[PDB]
Amino acid sequence: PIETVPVKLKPGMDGPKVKQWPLTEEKIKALVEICTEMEKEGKISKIGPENPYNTPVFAIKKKDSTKWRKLVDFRELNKRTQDFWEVQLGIPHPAGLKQKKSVTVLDVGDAYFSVPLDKDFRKYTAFTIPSINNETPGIRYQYNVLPQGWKGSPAIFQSSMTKILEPFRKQNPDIVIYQYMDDLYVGSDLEIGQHRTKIEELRQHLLRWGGYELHPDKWTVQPIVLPEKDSWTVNDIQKLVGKLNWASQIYAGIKVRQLSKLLRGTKALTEVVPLTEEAELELAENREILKEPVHGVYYDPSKDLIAEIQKQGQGQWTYQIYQEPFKNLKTGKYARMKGAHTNDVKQLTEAVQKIATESIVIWGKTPKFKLPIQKETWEAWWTEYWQATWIPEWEFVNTPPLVKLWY
Amino acid sequence: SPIETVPVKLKPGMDGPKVKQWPLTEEKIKALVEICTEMEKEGKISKIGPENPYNTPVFAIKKKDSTKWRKLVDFRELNKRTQDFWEVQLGIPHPAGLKQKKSVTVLDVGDAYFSVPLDKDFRKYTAFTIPSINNETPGIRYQYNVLPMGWKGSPAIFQSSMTKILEPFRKQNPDIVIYQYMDDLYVGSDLEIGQHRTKIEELRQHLLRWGFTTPDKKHQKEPPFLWMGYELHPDKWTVQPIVLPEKDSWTVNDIQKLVGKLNWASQIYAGIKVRQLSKLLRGTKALTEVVPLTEEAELELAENREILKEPVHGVYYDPSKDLIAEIQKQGQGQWTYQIYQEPFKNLKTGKYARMKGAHTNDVKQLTEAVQKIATESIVIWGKTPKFKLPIQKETWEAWWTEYWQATWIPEWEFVNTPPLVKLWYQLEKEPIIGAETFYVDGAANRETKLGKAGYVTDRGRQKVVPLTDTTNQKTELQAIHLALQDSGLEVNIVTDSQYALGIIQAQPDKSESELVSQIIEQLIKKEKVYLAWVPAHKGIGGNEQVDKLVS
Ligand SMILES: OC[C@H]1O[C@@](CO)(O[C@H]2O[C@H](CO)[C@@H](O)[C@H](O)[C@H]2O)[C@@H](O)[C@@H]1O
Numbered sequence: 015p016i017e018t019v020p021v022k023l024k025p026g027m028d029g030p031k032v033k034q035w036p037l038t039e040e041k042i043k044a045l046v047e048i049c050t051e052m053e054k055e056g057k058i059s060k061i062g063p064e065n066p067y068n069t070p071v072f073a074i075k076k077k078d079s080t081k082w083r084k085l086v087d088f089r090e091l092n093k094r095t096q097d098f099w100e101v102q103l104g105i106p107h108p109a110g111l112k113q114k115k116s117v118t119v120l121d122v123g124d125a126y127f128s129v130p131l132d133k134d135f136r137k138y139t140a141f142t143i144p145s146i147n148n149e150t151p152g153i154r155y156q157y158n159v160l161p162q163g164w165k166g167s168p169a170i171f172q173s174s175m176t177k178i179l180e181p182f183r184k185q186n187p188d189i190v191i192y193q194y195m196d197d198l199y200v201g202s203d204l205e206i207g208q209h210r211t212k213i214e215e216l217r218q219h220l221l222r223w224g225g226y227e228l229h230p231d232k233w234t235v236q237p238i239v240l241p242e243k244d245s246w247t248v249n250d251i252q253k254l255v256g257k258l259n260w261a262s263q264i265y266a267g268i269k270v271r272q273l274s275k276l277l278r279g280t281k282a283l284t285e286v287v288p289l290t291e292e293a294e295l296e297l298a299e300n301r302e303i304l305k306e307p308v309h310g311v312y313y314d315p316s317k318d319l320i321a322e323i324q325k326q327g328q329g330q331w332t333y334q335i336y337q338e339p340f341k342n343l344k345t346g347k348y349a350r351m352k353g354a355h356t357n358d359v360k361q362l363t364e365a366v367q368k369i370a371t372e373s374i375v376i377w378g379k380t381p382k383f384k385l386p387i388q389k390e391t392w393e394a395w396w397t398e399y400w401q402a403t404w405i406p407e408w409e410f411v412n413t414p415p416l417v418k419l420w421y
Numbered sequence: 422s423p424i425e426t427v428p429v430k431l432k433p434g435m436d437g438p439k440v441k442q443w444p445l446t447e448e449k450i451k452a453l454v455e456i457c458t459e460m461e462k463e464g465k466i467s468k469i470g471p472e473n474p475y476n477t478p479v480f481a482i483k484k485k486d487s488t489k490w491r492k493l494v495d496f497r498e499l500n501k502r503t504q505d506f507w508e509v510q511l512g513i514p515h516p517a518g519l520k521q522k523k524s525v526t527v528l529d530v531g532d533a534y535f536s537v538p539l540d541k542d543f544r545k546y547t548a549f550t551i552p553s554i555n556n557e558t559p560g561i562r563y564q565y566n567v568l569p570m571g572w573k574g575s576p577a578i579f580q581s582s583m584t585k586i587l588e589p590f591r592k593q594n595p596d597i598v599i600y601q602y603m604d605d606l607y608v609g610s611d612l613e614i615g616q617h618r619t620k621i622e623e624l625r626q627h628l629l630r631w632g633f634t635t636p637d638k639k640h641q642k643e644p645p646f647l648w649m650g651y652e653l654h655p656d657k658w659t660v661q662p663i664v665l666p667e668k669d670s671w672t673v674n675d676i677q678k679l680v681g682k683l684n685w686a687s688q689i690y691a692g693i694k695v696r697q698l699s700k701l702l703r704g705t706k707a708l709t710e711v712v713p714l715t716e717e718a719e720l721e722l723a724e725n726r727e728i729l730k731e732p733v734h735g736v737y738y739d740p741s742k743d744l745i746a747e748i749q750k751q752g753q754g755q756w757t758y759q760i761y762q763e764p765f766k767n768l769k770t771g772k773y774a775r776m777k778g779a780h781t782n783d784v785k786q787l788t789e790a791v792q793k794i795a796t797e798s799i800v801i802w803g804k805t806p807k808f809k810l811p812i813q814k815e816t817w818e819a820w821w822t823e824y825w826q827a828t829w830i831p832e833w834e835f836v837n838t839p840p841l842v843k844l845w846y847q848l849e850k851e852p853i854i855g856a857e858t859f860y861v862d863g864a865a866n867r868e869t870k871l872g873k874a875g876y877v878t879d880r881g882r883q884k885v886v887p888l889t890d891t892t893n894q895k896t897e898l899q900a901i902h903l904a905l906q907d908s909g910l911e912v913n914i915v916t917d918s919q920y921a922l923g924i925i926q927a928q929p930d931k932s933e934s935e936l937v938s939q940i941i942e943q944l945i946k947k948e949k950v951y952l953a954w955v956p957a958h959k960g961i962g963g964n965e966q967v968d969k970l971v972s
Contacts, residue, residue: 034511036796039803063577064427066505144511146803147518149600151509151580249852252915252955252962259956270959277962280860282879283852283913283953325825358827387827394792395829414923415825416954 018132019170022096029067029138030090034152035393037144041073044082045143048073049155057127058155061140065156071141072397083121086141087405088163094138098169105168107378111190114201117228117375118213121403123196125224126160126167129174139164162196162403178223182216194374196403201230201375230375236332236347238304238419240297249283251276257417258300264340265303272296311341319343319381321369322411323362324420329355331365332420335373335381344376345420362387363399370406382407422632424586426540427578430504437475437546438498447554449481452490454551457563465535466563473562475548493571494549500573502546509580514600514607515688516651516658517760517768518801521737522598522609524617525653527646528625529639530583533604534568534575536632537582547572576603586631590624607648618642657734660689665726674708676701683725684772689735690728691770692757697721736766744768744806746794749838750783754931756790760798760806771797780929780937783842784820787812791830808833812842819844824927845930846944849951856911856949857882859904860963863896863918864971874899877967882907885970897921898936905943905950912950917957917964925952 023029037045052058070087098104111117131139139161142152160167168175175193183191189212192199200216202209206227213225238261240254255270255277262268272293281287289297317337324332329350336342348365362385370380385392389410431437445453460466477499482491530536539547547565568575583601591599597620600607608624610617625635645652645659652659663686666679680695680702687693697717705712714722742762749757756773773790791808798806810833821828852858858879865872865888874896875885886903888896897918904914916922924937925944932938944950955964 031505031507036799037803038799038805042803062427062581063506063509063574064429064504066507068507140507142507142509142511147600147801148510148512148514148602149598151584151601152511153584154507154509247852248962249913249953252953255959255961256954256956259959274959274961280877280879280881280963280966281858283858283915283951284854285879325827327822357829358821359829362827386825390789390792391826391828394795412826412923414919414926416919416922 016130018130019101021132021135021166021170023094023138024096027094029094030069030088031067032069032087032090034068034070034142034144035072037072039146041082042144042146044073045071045084046153048082048084049143049153053155055127057159058157059136061137061154061156063154065137065140065154067138067140068154069139069141071143074397074400076401083403084162085400085403085405086139086161086163088139088161088165089405089407091138092163092165095164095166098166101169103169103172105172105193105378108190108192111192111199111201112230112376114190115203115229115231116206116209117199117201117230118209118225119228119371120198120200120213120217120220120225121196122193122198122220123162123403125175125178125220126162126171126196128224129160129167129171131157131160163405165195168193168195178220182219186212192374192378194378194404197374199375226371228371228375230372233346233372235307235345236420237307237345240301240304245286246289247283248277248281248285248287251287252283253417254297257419260417260419261300261304264342265308268300268303269296308342311343313337313343313377315377319373319377319379320384321373321381322384323348323365323369323386324415325358325362325386326418326421329361330421331361333365333369334420335369344372346372347420359387359391359395360399362392363396366406366408367400367402370402370404380404380406382409384409384411386411386413388412422536422538424537424582424631426538427581429540429543429574429578431502431546432504435502437548438477438496438502439474440476440478440498442476442550442552442560443478443480444555445481445552449490450551450554452481453479453492454561456490456492457551457561460535461563463535465567466565469545469548469562469564471559471562473545473548473564475546476562477547477549479549479551494547494569496547496569496571496573499546503573506574506577508577509584510576510603512800514602514649515769515801516649516653517735517738519600519607519609519653519658519737520598520740521655523611524609524614525644525646525655526608526617526621527641527648527653528606528608528621528635530604530606530628530633531636531639532634533583534570534579536634537568537579539565539567539569579603583633586628586633590627594620602649605648607646654734657736659734660686663729665729671701671712671714672708673702673705673710673712676712677708679722686725686729687757687772688769689733689767691733691759691767692728692751693725693772694721694751694755694757694774695725695772696753696755696774733767735769736763738762738768738802744798744802744804745809746791746798746806747809747836747838748787748790748794748811750787750811750840750842752840754781754786756786758790758794760794769801776933779934780924780927780932782844782928782930784812784816784844787842788828788830791833795831805831807831809836810834810842811836811838811840816841816843819847823847844928845941846928846947846950848926848928849949852913852951852953853911853949856913856951857908858913858915858963859908860915860967861897861900861904862916862957862964862967862971863888863893863898863900864968865891865893865896867893872896873971874903875967875971876900876904876907877963877970879963883967883970894918894920895936898924898934898940901925901952902936902940902943905940905947910948912947913953914950915953915955915963917955917968919954922952922954 073082136156139157142154190201255273276287321335331348333346334342335344350361373380385408478495480493544564551561553560598609644654650661665682683693683695701712746760758771760768773793795805859876861876863874872888872891877883898921955961
C-alpha cells in the first residue's frame with residue numbers, strides 16, 4: 015500500500031519529444047533483457063504510439079562491474095519538471111564532503127523502484143528500444159516507478175532515504191553522505207582499507223532495507239603562468255602582452271604599459287629586445303598577482319555552473335568552472351592516465367565526467383559544459399565511454415586558441 | 422479485427438473538423454455510393470446522420486489502368502486536430518543487413534488498415550458525406566469504424582497492432598527472422614523448405630485468427646523476391662531498375678527528380694556524383710524554370726549514365742566476418758564509399774557530399790564521411806566497420822596534434838588510392854628567421870560599407886587599399902590577403918582579427934567565400950607562414966603603425 019506524490023511539469027511546458035538514436039547490437043540486446051525483466055516486475059509497462067512523448071535510452075558498462083547498466087537520458091524531462099525546492103523536497107549540499115580523504119560513489123538507483131510514480135505523470139517517461147536493421151518497429155515502455163535518472167526520484171524518495179541512513183549516520187557521525195540523482199557520495203578521513211570496509215557495511219545495510227574512489231583533498235587549481243626566459247624576442251613580448259591583457263579582465267591591477275613600450279616601432283618578430291628594468295618590475299608584479307586566487311569570487315547557489323575545456327595536446331586538458339564570465343570558481347588541469355593516449359574523444363568524455371564529479375562534490379550539481387568539439391564527432395562516440403548514471407548539460411563551441419592562456 | 426483499439430484524442434481545446442463537401446459529378450457520386458455500400462457491408466464504415474456536426478471532404482479518383490474509381494477522404498483538417506503520435510517506424514530495413522537464409526518467403530496482409538478497428542469514441546470525427554446530385558437530398562453520411570487511409574494516426578496504430586499480433590509467434594520461433602515493414606512480412610529460416618512452409622502457414626493461421634488475411638497474389642514463394650524496392654536472390658540482391666529522365670529541355674523539377682534517382686542508385690552503384698547537377702538547382706525561382714545544363718553537369722550526367730549501364734548486385738551479411746568500409750575522394754567535397762567483407766563483393770555503397778560550414782578542409786570532410794558511414798553501419802548491422810582511408814597516418818597525426826578541437830577516427834588502415842587526403846599547408850609554430858614581418862589591419866565603416874585594408878613592415882614597406890561594399894570582417898581578411906600577395910615565400914603576419922586568425926588556423930582548403938578561397942590559394946603557394954595575433958588599440962608595435970595608416 016503506497017500513495018503517489020502528485021507531480022507537474024512546469025507551467026507552459028509539454029513533455030519530452032526526443033528521438034531515439036541508433037544503438038549497437040550488444041546495447042540493444044542488453045536493453046531488451048533489462049526491459050523485459052523490468053516489465054515482468056511491473057516497474058515499466060509496454061505502451062503504444064498514442065503516447066506522444068519519448069526520451070533516448072542507451073546502456074553502459076562500468077569498467078570494474080561488467081554487467082550492462084540501462085541509462086535513460088532524462089535531461090529534457092528534468093528541465094521540464096516542477097522544482098522541488100517548492101514542495102520542500104530538495105536535498106541540501108553538505109560542505110565538508112569536499113574536505114575528505116576519500117569519497118566513494120555508489121549507484122543507489124534501484125532503491126527508487128520501490129515507490130510508485132504518480133499515475134498522471136508516467137506518460138512523460140516513455141522510451142523506445144530500436145531494432146537492428148529496422149527488422150521491427152520500435153518497442154515503447156513507460157515507467158510505473160520512480161525512474162532512475164529523473165530528478166524527481168531523489169526528491170520524492172528523500173524522506174525514505176533519510177530513514178535508511180539514520181542508523182549509519184548516527185553510528186558514523188564523521189562520515190558525510192550526499193545524495194545526487196541516483197548516486198550516493200560517501201566521504202571519510204579514514205585510511206583506504208578501513209574506509210572501504212565502512213563502504214561495504216553501508217552496502218550491506220542498504221541491501222537489507224532493499225564504487226569510484228575520489229580524493230578531493232588532492233584536486234589542485236592550475237593557475238595562469240607566465241614563461242620565464244632570459245632573452246626575449248618581439249614575438250615573445252607580444253605574446254606576453256596579449257596574455258596579460260586578457261588576464262586583466264579577471265585579475266586586478268595588471269599593467270602592460272612598460273612591456274608594451276619595449277615594442278615601439280615596426281620591428282621584426284625575431285628581434286631580441288632586452289627587458290627594461292622597469293618592464294622587469296612590471297613583469298614581476300603581474301607574476302605575483304597571477305600567483306594567488308582572485309579576490310571577490312564566491313559561489314552563488316541560484317546561478318548555474320558553467321565549464322570550459324581546452325585541448326592542450328599530449329593528453330592534457332585545461333578547464334575552468336564559473337558562473338559569471340571571468341569570475342572563475344575553479345581552474346584545473348585534467349590528465350589522461352590510461353597509457354593508450356590515442357583518443358581525443360574518450361579523453362574529453364572522461365574529462366567531462368571528472369569535472370562534473372568534482373562539481374557534484376564541491377557544489378552539489380553539475381555544470382553546463384562548453385565542449386571543444388564538433389557536435390557530430392561527439393555524438394558519434396561519447397556513449398562508448400560514458401560511465402556515470404547522470405548526464406550533464408552541454409553545448410558545442412569552436413573557439414580557436416587566441417593565446418594559450420591556461421598552459 | 423478483435424485486437425483492442427488504441428485510444429486516440431483530439432488535440433486539447435480542439436473540436437472535430439467541420440469542412441464542407443465539394444459538389445461532385447453524378448458519376449463520382451455513383452461510384453462513391455457503390456464503394457461505400459460494400460464497405461458498409463463489410464463493416465468498415467457506418468451510416469450517420471446530420472446530428473453529428475463533423476465533416477471531411479470525400480473525392481473520387483481514377484484507378485491505375487482499370488478506370489475503376491477510388492475513394493479518397495481528405496483528412497488534412499482532422500489530422501491537424503488529432504493528437505500527436507510517437508512514431509515507431511524508426512528506419513527502413515536494408516537488404517545488405519540480411520543474412521543468407523536457406524528458405525525465404527515474402528507475404529503481405531490484405532486490407533491491412535481496414536482490418537484494425539478505430540477507437541469507438543473517435544469515430545464521429547471521421548465523418549464524411551456523399552453529396553446528392555444538385556442537392557436532391559442532403560446526402561449520405563458515413564463514419565469510419567477502422568483505421569482510415571489518410572488519417573495521421575493510421576500507420577502507427579497499425580504498426581503497433583501488428584507488432585502485438587506477431588509477438589507470440591516471434592518468441593515461440595526465435596530462429597525465424599521476420600522483417601515487418603507496415604503490412605509486408607519477410608520471413609527467412611534455416612529450415613528445410615517442407616518444414617519452412619509448415620511454419621509459414623502456422624503463421625498465416627495466427628494472423629487469420631486476428632483478422633489479417635494473407636492473399637495468395639501477395640504470397641511469394643520463389644526467388645527473386647520483390648521486397649522494399651529490391652530483388653532478393655539466394656546469393657545476391659538487386660535494386661529494381663532505375664530509369665532516369667532523358668529530357669532535351671530540363672526544368673528545375675526535372676533536375677530535382679534526376680538527383681533524387683541518382684541518390685537512390687548510389688546505395689549500390691559506386692561512384693555516383695551529383696554536385697554539378699545539384700549546382701543547377703541553386704538560385705532558381707520556379708519548379709518550371711528551364712535550366713540549361715552546364716558543361717560540368719553534362720559530363721557528370723554522362724559519367725553517372727555510364728555507371729548505371731553496367732549491372733550491379735550487393736551481397737548479404739555474414740556476421741562471422743568483419744565489416745570493411747573504404748572511402749575514395751572524388752573532388753569538390755565529394756566522397757564515395759563501399760562496404761564489404763570479402764574483396765570486390767560489396768554489401769552496399771554510398772556517397773557523402775555535404776558542405777558543412779562556410780570554411781572547411783578535406784580532413785574534416787573525411788571525418789564527416791567516417792561518421793556518416795559509422796552511423797549507417799550501426800543502423801544496418803549493429804556494429805561499426807574497419808576503415809580503409811586514403812590518408813597517411815602522418816597526415817592524420819599532424820592534424821589532430823595541431824588542431825584544437827578534439828577529433829578521432831576509429832581503427833583504419835591507409836589505402837593508397839589517389840588523390841590522397843592531405844593538409845595543403847601548415848602554419849609555422851614559431852616566427853620565421855629572415856622573413857619580413859607584416860603588420861596588417863583592415864577597418865570598415867559600419868554605416869558606409871566603405872573600408873580600407875593595409876600593412877606596414879619591418880622592412881619599411883607599407884600599403885593601403887580602399888574597399889567598397891565591404892564589412893569589418895572582410896577588410897581584415899582583405900588585409901591578410903594583401904600581405905600574402907606582396908610578400909615572399911616566407912612571411913610573418915601579425916593581425917588583430919581573432920575572426921580571421923580563427924578561420925586560417927583551422928587550415929581550410931575550400932570556402933564558400935571567394936576571398937577566403939583566394940587566401941587559401943595563397944597559403945598553399947607559400948613555403949612558410951607564421952600568423953600571430955595582438956589585441957587592437959593597445960598601441961603595440963607594428964599594429965599601432967598600421968592601424969594609424971588605415972585611418
Ligand atoms: O548532444 C546534444 C544532443 O543531445 C540530445 C539527445 O538527442 O539531447 C540533449 O541535448 C542537450 C545536451 O545538454 C540538452 O539541451 C537536451 O535537453 C538533452 O536532451 C539532443 O537534443 C541534442 O541534439
